[PDB]
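Dear colleague,

Following up on Tuesday's group meeting, I ran the structure prediction for the two-component complex that the binding team flagged. I've pasted the input sequences exactly as they went in, so you can double-check that nothing got truncated or mislabelled along the way. The structure tokens for the whole assembly follow below. Feel free to forward this to whoever is handling the docking comparison.

Inputs:
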Amino acid sequence: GKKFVARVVELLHDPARNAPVARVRFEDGEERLILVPEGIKVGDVVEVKKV
Amino acid sequence: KKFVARVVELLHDPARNAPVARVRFEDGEERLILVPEGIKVGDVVEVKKV
């Protein structure tokens, strides 16, 4: 359907994992923390999608 | 590459439009993320940049 997207607003570091966690912002103004891939920058948009 | 995880649980909170899914990543780590409507338990989701 419509692409499920969120804007990356902050990039944090998870020390347990050596991996980035982005603070993201949904269309309704909700903000959550997600594991993201490498190469994500603040200001990008990420999609969650079935494979 | 392809950053993926398998939906283990899925819950519709009447408080938001999108459902909350508990996903299992590569190493076994589990977290709660918002998924699109129509994700069912057992699906694999991908987090990618657009």
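Residues 7 and 42 of chain B are 5 Å apart (CA to CA).

Cheers,
M.
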